[PDB]
Ligand binder design. Structure first.
Ligand SMILES: *[C@@](C)(CO)[C@](*)(O)[C@H](CC(C)C)NC(=O)[C@H](Cc1ccccc1)NC(=O)[C@H](CC(C)C)NC(=O)[C@H](CCc1ccccc1)NC(=O)CN1CCOCC1
Ligand SMILES: *[C@@](C)(CO)[C@](*)(O)[C@H](CC(C)C)NC(=O)[C@H](Cc1ccccc1)NC(=O)[C@H](CC(C)C)NC(=O)[C@H](CCc1ccccc1)NC(=O)CN1CCOCC1
Ligand SMILES: *[C@@](C)(CO)[C@](*)(O)[C@H](CC(C)C)NC(=O)[C@H](Cc1ccccc1)NC(=O)[C@H](CC(C)C)NC(=O)[C@H](CCc1ccccc1)NC(=O)CN1CCOCC1
Ligand SMILES: [Cl-]
Ligand SMILES: [Mg+2]
Ligand SMILES: [Mg+2]
Ligand SMILES: [Mg+2]
Ligand SMILES: [Mg+2]
Ligand SMILES: [Mg+2]
Lengths: 125, 196, 222, 226, 211, 51, 204, 195, 233, 195
């Protein structure tokens, strides 16, 4: 198997591959989250460079992870699908093993853990 | 089966009957149970026909590969390869094999390998279902350093009796002579050996 | 362990007409994949215009027939040479079979003849004496091959009259002896093709008021 | 099944019956038991029908690839060796009992092979349920230095013995002759001694005899244009 | 098999199919599973055809010698008990019988269930055989005491049909009987093939089946 | 029959995998998917080597 | 216990003059219990027809499997599969489960679109091919069907005549089997038209 | 577990399942719900060996709920029943098969039709107007064969179900402690609290 | 119920134009051990019948005594014991068949297969088989054990049906029997070279041949057979 | 058969026996009386294998009735129970033993005391204040151990019996179709027609 260490430290104590991943996020369309007293609103930018688009079928920016939790993102679109799929699987796995839906804090901790794992595993970016 | 191998002055002689059975039906009456694993290292096969063929084929492969690298193998070496197969696969095999060969240094040697996979070096050996009936005869009549003609008669007479009493033995008596002179095949038909 | 039973193969067939009856059976005797005899009679004239065939385990079939023939003999002695009716024979055979309820005769059994009104009769027996009068019955190795064919060609089952489309059945017209013997030969020729225990020969016994007549036809020997 | 193999002067011949059973029932009256491994290597099979086919198709496929790789015509000993090692590995669970014969650059050959992986050499061989009936004939009539015509006769006579005397065998006789320096001739239905006689009656029904409930056209065609 | 019988105001209804089986093979379809012991006594058969036939025919002969010695027709209870004691001797030996002894005597209509296991039970409604479980649904749901002879005959017929449809080892034809104080009355042989379609149309039942 | 988007997502996920792990070159292919299903009707999609 | 006789059912196929016919019963059971009277056992992949008897779960599974394989065959080959070729695919697929087989008795029927030759074939549960000229039978009443077909069948029958022969073979065999019946279907197949007829039979 | 029934009427599917759980000679519970909601318009009842039943149902439930979230779309009852069958047909040749029989009752919102599927542990699927698993159908099918019409109302379906249960309670030797009844229609799934 | 200990193998027989022939080898096997080499398994009863027996030898010796006693008993108060009221093959057979079926019905069988060969008073050929189960059948050729599998096919090539019997001479029939005995020696692992043969002719009477040997055997081709496949030396 | 209970109170013996008869998966009857009057003041209930039960009870009944006629005297419950035990102890070493368990409830008119005997199929006899056969006692003995007094009235004995039956109906998986109750006292034997 491909075991190459892609995410590594540099002399100044930086992991460039992780920092370059943040540059991909900087390029991505804007996403915003605001929580009120009894609600949360997620706003997302759609770049108008792409017209002739079919808005019915185009992947929406906000994704439901479960019936009570949503996830929006900024950065590489293809990468986001992998995290969303994993999060959705974990959400059902939690309901299945513990008989409660995930807390928002738990789901976040899982997704964040997946992201971290890809910063010190061989052969992956 | 009825198989035997006997050492003598000039080398060693292998002997066998030619019957293979399926219950009481004789599936083949002209079987060759004397099989060659090297130029002057042969074996007598008893037990499962499938198992003993599979084993002998693997051994012939091992000794062919041995020869290509290290030259002519000893009869002891051939017996060791047989043993290793018969011992390590003892749960799944039913094979009673006698290994016989001629060196110029060691001359005639005989090794018998029964069911368990143990090895026993002997002056002569008998095996197969029909061997039971000639333990007494062979013990009484065997001598060391016999002539070729004496040894042929000893095997002929021994297998004649084994065939006479054992239903699982019969047909012709095949023999293979292993000496410095070369390899000689002999055959003896019922009309010859029954009247002994 | 000793197994007192065996299977000698064979197949039999009884068909009742309006004023006649036939009892047919192949002449082949077997054990496993071997043929014992290509011609070993299996259907017998037992007297009083009654024909009988009991087989499966040949030794038990031979004994049952032998006993029933004996029963007919003693029926004459004990009741002033009175003729044993087919219905009386059937009931007698039940009691011969059930006398060994706990060590059965391993056989299929069929008798045929004429009833007391002169009409054709066929009775069928299971190994322990359950019997039934029927119009058509096959027994033995290839019984399952033949019976459906007879349901169709003797009782006109699943056959309706064209034009009506399933509203009106095919009427139950009686069959002649010549028409019946054709069904018998076709039944056994078909069974010989697909069953290995059936073949060699076919012996038919026809029963009328005039008596008992025989007919023999060859079958394939493979 | 009954199958045989007989050597002769300049080649070898094999033969087989054409019955396949399922208990006491005959499933196929004209089964083909002679299989082609390579153009001049044929084998006859007894036992589990699917196994004799599958094992033959497999070794024949590998023999073809071997022949292409080596730029040589395949040998009978190669087919023999590949078969026995395959069967031995499955410890008898693949119920194929075969008679393998053929001609190659080495000459003409005749072998038998059992399900557990044992092979035998001979001038005449027989396998299957009818092997005893066939071997009785072979032991009575075989001689050294047979001609092609004598060997075909002996072989078909041996199969007939099985057809008539064994319930597991029947119908027709298939033959394949493999002579040195010639094309192999596959004689399908060489003998046909078991044709069914004419039926006494025709059972063709009047149209309208069967009761019907519904009728409908079945669309087998693809989705249409326009 | 499927057999049933039930007591009611105007006597006792007895009904049965006619199928006989040897594994999956239907050996016969013209079997009489109701045996006439006397003009006032009926017996049903289920399980071993040979067993049921032999012992119930032997019982009918016991019931006849009873009438000769005693100048009196045997009771349903006594008849059922003679059978029960007869089969009890051979208990554990392999007998397979499931029977109902139906009749009319001094105490009125009588109905006893008797089997080879040893049971002997008096009751107003029974059904024995592989298809009994299907028949019980129709009986229990529609059974009264104040049932007309016409409606009672139909109920027993419809109950066998229900079982004959579902149970693979039940079918052929329906045999009906009605037992009065003047004796039993045969009410015909009814082919299930024809009866099924008739009932489907007239009643509206078996909507799932197409015809 | 598979909904169009589900098929498209699957192929696009395969393309994505080659950009994140394995150390292999991506597929140098861009697709235009034309399809129909009973949910969204007629649909056009595109995918590129990024997934 | 016997997987091949739990659910019950039968299939029969016949050749005629420039035509073939394949028929089946509609019963699905759990031993003695009848569960469905609409369980059709005949499927088609283009112009090739497949009847399957035996364990119902394996019947359903194999249909879905051959639909899968024939749909791919068509996409790659750019043509519908033929009966001779499909017959080899069925055999291959069954033998790959040699030591854990599907408990089925398949029957192939169809007409080669190029040569116009009628074709039928039968298999055992592990893949052995029985390519017959006259007829093929399968199911719990296979003995009964062999008896009916072997006596009623005659070669070179016309479609409307063949229909009556195969229908009577099925119906009368099914009526001597406890585990077969509850309806029946017959497919009459010609080179470019296929008719499907439901038969009226006893529902017991 | 013991008895599970199903009946498809004009505009709905009704599932009746027994309440008893039994370990040997003792009734552990008399109010057990042998059903899982797979989706808002699809309900699955189940019965078989202890553990296998609930493990399988909840596994199916999780898979369908995952599909619903991923696509933001409810699978048809036919699609669900086919998924379940494949899982059971896959299971039967595994090292230790799930010993579970199920009924799937659903309302297809696209076709505006109720649908009932019966699937046994072997993976044997059949669409039915009414069905049952185990020894249940033996007692109930004769009544359903008699009384059932496809144009029945939900109320008529419940009355016919009461008749089926009354017969079970009379002729079954085992006490199954009554049934929980649930109706699946266009508006979703609801429980009949008085039966 | 028992198991057979010391056993005798095939008995073979066939009809010909004027009588019957029957043959059996002289071996009494003890499992795979060929224990007893001088065992007579053909037993004449008068000058018109020969009973050939296979299977358990202790049960054979019992049957042999029953037959000897049968002759003694038939002579009792019978002036025509050597004439009209002599024992017939059909009488001898039915007696044995009665005994065999009775013994199987008590679950204590005589572990044998028997062929009764002879010629009746009217010159008709008699040939019938009976075994431990009481199963009986008749045919132009009959054989027990291995003979049923190997001998019958060869003998049926001479007499395939009833109409072939008048066309078959004693020289042809004997030749066929002797050949069959050779084949059984090739192929039956519980057979011997030494055998006995008996002919019962309606003209020349009973001819009982002892100490016959299988001769004209083919073994020479064995020298050319080497290995089991690939071996050349 | 299934459940047979017995309780001896101050002045009487109460026997409660189930009504169900079962053949496989079907309840044949729901009003079976599993008892025989051996004498005017002695009642025997029974349960075991089909046939054996009734054959044995009626055999005992015939023997006691014969004794009564011969001597013009009623045997004591103790004497009857001893006779029954001997017949069962004799039976257990026979070719085919009677597979029957019994309770004998009687009022001894000499001692003016009720008596209850429990005897199993082996011939194991025990005199008790209350007893049960099969799986019955497993559910009922804890209540009887708690509530029973020897000075109880017949009415108090019946109320305690209702409590025992209520527990059986809750925790037993098998439906035994209620019980027939009979009281044995100085005035003889009578049946409680409402229970
Ligand atoms: C003498 C016979 C005894 O020691 C010799 O040893 C010869 C040796 C030569 C041939 C190598 N041995 C045999 O002939 C040998 C005897 C034997 C039999 C069974 C097991 C082990 C040894 N015979 C065979 O191996 C035959 C050869 C076939 C006919 C070509 N094979 C069988 O008999 C096969 C073997 C299957 C088997 C069973 C148990 C262990 C290993 C393998 N058996 C069968 O085909 C079954 N057969 C058919 C049904 O009736 C039962 C016997
Ligand atoms: C002679 C005719 C008999 O000895 C020959 O040996 C021929 C050989 C030719 C055809 C290659 N042998 C057979 O015909 C052979 C006999 C046989 C039967 C059973 C076991 C071994 C040998 N017959 C078969 O192999 C048939 C071929 C069919 C009719 C096309 N197959 C079966 O009978 C299969 C057996 C499959 C099997 C699986 C695993 C191990 C061994 C065999 N049996 C069935 O299909 C029966 N059943 C039908 C209902 O579905 C479930 C299975
Ligand atoms: C329904 C139809 C089935 O449950 C009914 O219960 C009917 C009752 C009617 C017939 C009175 N019962 C049967 O059909 C009954 C089922 C059965 C079978 C065997 C034992 C008990 C119950 N069938 C029979 O009794 C058949 C009737 C024949 C087909 C006319 N009889 C047999 O199967 C016989 C009897 C065997 C037997 C019983 C007791 C001791 C020894 C033997 N058996 C055979 O004929 C042998 N059988 C032939 C088919 O191939 C397998 C071997
Ligand atoms: Cl070998
Ligand atoms: Mg010998
Ligand atoms: Mg035949
Ligand atoms: Mg049917
Ligand atoms: Mg039915
Ligand atoms: Mg199901």
């Amino acid at each position: 198997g491909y075991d190459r260490a892609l995410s590594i430290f540099s002399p100044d104590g930086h992991i460039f591959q992780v920092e370059y991943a943040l540059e991909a996020v900087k390029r991505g369309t804007c996403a915003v989250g605001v929580k009120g007293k009894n609600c949360v609103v997620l706003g997302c930018e759609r770049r108008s460079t792409l017209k002739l688009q079919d808005t019915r079928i185009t992947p929406s920016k906000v994704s439901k992870i479960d019936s009570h939790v949503v996830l929006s993102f900024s950065g590489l679109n293809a990468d986001s699908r992998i995290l969303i799929e994993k999060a959705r699987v974990e959400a059902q796995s939690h309901r299945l093993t513990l008989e409660d839906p995930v807390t928002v804090e738990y789901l976040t901790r899982y997704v964040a853990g997946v992201q971290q794992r890809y910063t010190q595993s061989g052969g992956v970016r | 089966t009825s198989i035997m191998a006997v050492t003598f002055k000039d080398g060693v002689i292998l002997g066998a009957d030619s019957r293979t059975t399926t219950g009481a039906y004789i599936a083949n009456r002209v079987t060759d149970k004397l099989t060659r694993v090297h130029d002057k290292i042969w074996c007598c096969r008893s037990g499962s026909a499938a198992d003993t063929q599979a084993i002998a084929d693997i051994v012939q492969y091992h000794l062919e590969l041995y020869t290509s690298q290290y030259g002519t193998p000893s009869t002891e070496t051939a017996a060791s390869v047989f043993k290793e197969l018969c011992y390590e696969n003892k749960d799944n095999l039913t094979a009673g094999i006698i290994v016989a060969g001629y060196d110029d240094k060691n001359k005639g040697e005989v090794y018998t390998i029964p069911l368990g996979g143990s090895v026993h070096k002997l002056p002569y050996a008998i095996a197969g279902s029909g061997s039971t009936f000639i333990y007494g005869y062979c013990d009484k009549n065997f001598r060391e350093n016999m002539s070729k003609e004496e040894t042929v008669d000893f095997i002929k007479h021994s297998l004649s009796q084994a065939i006479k009493w054992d239903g699982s033995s019969g047909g012709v008596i095949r023999m293979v002579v292993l000496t410095a002179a070369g390899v000689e095949r002999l055959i003896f038909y019922p009309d010859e050996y029954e009247q002994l | 362990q000793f197994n007192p039973y065996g299977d000698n193969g064979g197949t039999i067939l009884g068909i009742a007409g309006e004023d006649f009856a036939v009892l047919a059976g192949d002449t082949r005797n077997i054990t496993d994949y071997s043929i014992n005899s290509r011609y070993e009679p299996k259907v017998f004239d037992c007297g009083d215009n009654i024909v009988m065939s009991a087989n499966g385990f040949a030794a038990d079939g031979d004994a049952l027939v032998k006993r029933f023939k004996n029963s007919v003999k003693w029926y004459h002695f004990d009741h002033n040479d009175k003729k044993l009716s087919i219905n009386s024979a059937a009931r007698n055979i039940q009691h011969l079979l059930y006398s060994r309820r706990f060590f059965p005769y391993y056989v299929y059994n069929i008798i045929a003849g004429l009833d007391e009104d002169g009409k054709g009769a066929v009775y069928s027996f299971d190994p322990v004496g359950s019997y039934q009068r029927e119009q058509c019955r096959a027994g033995g190795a290839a019984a399952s091959l033949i019976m459906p064919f007879l349901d169709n060609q003797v009782n006109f089952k699943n056959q309706y009259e064209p034009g009506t489309n399933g509203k009106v059945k095919k009427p139950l017209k009686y069959l002649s002896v010549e028409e019946v013997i054709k069904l018998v030969r076709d039944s056994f020729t078909s069974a010989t093709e697909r069953h290995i225990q059936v073949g060699d020969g076919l012996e038919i016994l026809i029963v009328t008021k005039d008596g008992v007549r025989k007919e023999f036809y060859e079958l394939k020997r493979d | 099944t009954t199958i045989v193999g007989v050597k002769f002067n300049n080649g070898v011949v094999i033969a087989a019956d054409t019955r396949s059973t399922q208990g006491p029932i005959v499933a196929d009256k004209n089964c083909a038991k002679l299989h082609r491994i390579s153009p001049k290597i044929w084998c006859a099979g007894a036992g589990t029908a699917a196994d004799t086919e599958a094992v033959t198709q497999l070794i024949g496929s590998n023999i073809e690839l071997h022949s292409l790789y080596t730029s040589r015509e395949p040998r009978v000993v190669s087919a023999l060796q590949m078969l026995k090692q395959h069967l031995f590995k499955y410890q008898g669970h693949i119920g194929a009992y075969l008679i393998v014969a053929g001609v190659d650059p080495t000459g003409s050959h005749l072998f038998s092979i059992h399900a557990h992986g044992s092979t035998d050499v001979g001038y005449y061989l027989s396998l299957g349920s009818g092997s005893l009936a066939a071997m009785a004939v072979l032991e009575s009539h075989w001689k050294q230095d047979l001609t092609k015509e004598e060997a075909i006769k002996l072989a078909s006579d041996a199969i007939q013995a099985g057809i008539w005397n064994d319930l597991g065998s029947g119908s027709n006789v298939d033959v394949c002759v493999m002579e040195i320096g010639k094309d192999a001739e596959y004689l399908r239905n060489y003998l046909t001694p078991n044709v069914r006689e004419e039926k006494q009656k025709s059972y063709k029904f009047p149209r309208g005899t069967t009761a019907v409930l519904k009728e409908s056209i079945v669309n087998i065609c693809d989705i249409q244009e326009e | 098999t499927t057999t049933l019988a039930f007591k009611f105001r105007h006597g006792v209804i007895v009904a049965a199919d006619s199928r006989a089986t040897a594994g999956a093979y239907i050996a016969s379809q013209t079997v009489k599973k109701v045996i006439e012991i006397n003009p006032y006594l009926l017996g049903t058969m289920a399980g071993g055809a040979a067993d049921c036939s032999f012992w119930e025919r032997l019982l009918a002969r016991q019931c006849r010698i009873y009438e000769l010695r005693n100048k009196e027709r045997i009771s349903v209870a006594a008849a059922s008990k003679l059978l029960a004691n007869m089969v009890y001797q051979y208990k554990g030996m392999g007998l397979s019988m499931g029977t109902m002894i139906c009749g009319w005597d001094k105490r009125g209509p009588g109905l006893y269930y008797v089997d080879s296991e040893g049971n002997r039970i008096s009751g107003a409604t029974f059904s024995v055989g592989s298809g009994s479980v299907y028949a019980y649904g129709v009986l229990d749901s529609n059974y009264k005491w104040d049932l007309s002879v016409e409606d009672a005959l139909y109920l027993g017929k419809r109950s066998i049909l229900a079982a004959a449809h579902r149970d693979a080892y039940s079918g052929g034809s329906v045999n009906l009987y009605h037992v009065t104080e003047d004796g039993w009355i045969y009410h015909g042989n009814h082919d299930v093939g024809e009866l099924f379609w008739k009932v489907k149309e007239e009643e509206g039942s078996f909507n799932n089946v197409i015809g | 029959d598979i909904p169009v988007e589900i098929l498209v997502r699957r192929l696009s996920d395969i393309k994505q995998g080659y950009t994140q792990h394995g150390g292999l070159r991506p597929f140098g292919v861009s697709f235009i998917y034309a399809g129909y299903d009973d949910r969204y009707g007629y649909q056009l999609y595109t995918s590129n080597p990024s997934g | 216990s016997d997987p091949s006789s739990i659910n019950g059912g039968i299939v029969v196929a016949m050749t005629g003059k420039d035509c073939v016919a394949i028929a089946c019963d509609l019963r699905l059971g759990s031993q003695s219990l009848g569960v469905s009277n609409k369980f059709e056992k005949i499927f088609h992949y283009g112009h090739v027809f497949l009847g399957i008897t035996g364990l119902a779960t394996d019947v359903t599974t194999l249909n879905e499997m051959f639909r899968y394989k024939t749909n791919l065959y068509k996409l790659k080959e750019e043509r519908a599969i033929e009966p001779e070729t499909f017959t080899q695919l069925v055999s291959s697929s069954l033998y790959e489960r040699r030591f854990g087989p599907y408990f089925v008795g398949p029957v192939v029927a169809g007409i080669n679109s190029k040569s116009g030759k009628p074709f039928i074939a039968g298999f055992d549960l592990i893949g052995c091919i029985d390519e017959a000229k006259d007829f093929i039978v399968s199911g719990t009443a296979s003995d009964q069907l062999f008896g009916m077909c072997e006596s009623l069948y005659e070669p070179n029958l016309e479609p409307e005549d063949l229909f009556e022969t195969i229908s009577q073979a099925l119906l009368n065999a099914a009526d001597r089997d406890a585990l077969s019946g509850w309806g029946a279907v017959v497919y009459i197949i010609k080179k470019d038209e296929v008719v499907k007829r439901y038969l009226k039979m006893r529902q017991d | 577990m013991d008895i599970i029934l199903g009946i498809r009427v004009q505009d709905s599917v009704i599932l009746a399942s027994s309440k008893a759980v039994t370990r040997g000679i003792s009734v552990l519970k008399d109010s057990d719900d042998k059903t899982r909601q797979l989706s808002p318009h699809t309900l699955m009842s189940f019965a078989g060996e202890a553990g296998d039943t609930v493990q399988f149902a909840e596994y199916i439930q999780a898979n369908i709920q995952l599909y619903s979230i991923r696509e933001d779309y409810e699978l048809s009852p036919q699609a669900v029943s086919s998924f379940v069958r494949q899982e059971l047909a896959k299971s039967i040749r595994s090292r230790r098969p799930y010993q579970v029989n199920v009924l799937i009752g659903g309302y297809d919102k696209k076709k505006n039709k109720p649908e009932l599927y019966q699937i046994d542990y072997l993976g044997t699927k059949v669409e039915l107007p009414y069905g049952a698993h185990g020894y249940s159908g033996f007692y109930t099918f004769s009544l359903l064969d008699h009384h059932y019409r496809p144009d029945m109302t939900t109320e008529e379906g419940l009355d016919l179900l009461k008749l089926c249960v009354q017969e079970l309670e009379k002729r079954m030797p085992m006490d199954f402690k009554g049934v929980i009844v649930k109706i699946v229609d266009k508006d979703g799934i609801r429980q009949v609290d008085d039966f | 119920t028992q198991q057979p200990i010391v056993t005798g193998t095939s008995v073979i027989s066939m009809k010909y134009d004027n009588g019957v022939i029957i043959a059996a080898d002289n071996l009494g096997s003890y499992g795979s051990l060929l224990r007893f080499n001088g065992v007579e398994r053909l037993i004449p009863v008068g000058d018109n019948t020969v009973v050939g027996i296979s299977g358990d030898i202790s049960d054979m010796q019992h049957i042999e005594r029953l037959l000897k006693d049968l002759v003694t008993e038939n002579a009792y108060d019978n002036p025509l014991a050597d004439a009209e009221e002599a024992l017939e093959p059909s009488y001898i057979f039915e007696y044995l068949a009665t005994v065999m079926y009775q013994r199987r019905s008590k679950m204590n069988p005589l572990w044998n297969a028997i062929i009764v060969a002879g010629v009746q008073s009217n010159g008709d050929q008699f040939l019938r088989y009976v075994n431990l189960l009481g199963v009986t059948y008749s045919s132009p050729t009959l054989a027990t054990g291995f003979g049923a599998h190997m001998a019958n096919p060869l003998l049926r090539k001479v007499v395939d049906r009833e109409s072939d019997i008048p066309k078959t001479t004693v020289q042809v029939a004997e030749e066929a029997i002797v050949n069959a005995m050779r084949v059984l020696y090739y192929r039956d692992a519980r057979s011997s070279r030494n055998f006995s043969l008996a002919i019962i002719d309606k003209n020349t009477g009973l001819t009982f041949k002892k100490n016959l040997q299988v001769e004209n055997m083919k073994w020479d081709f064995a020298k050319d057979i080497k290995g089991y496949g690939t071996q050349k030396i």
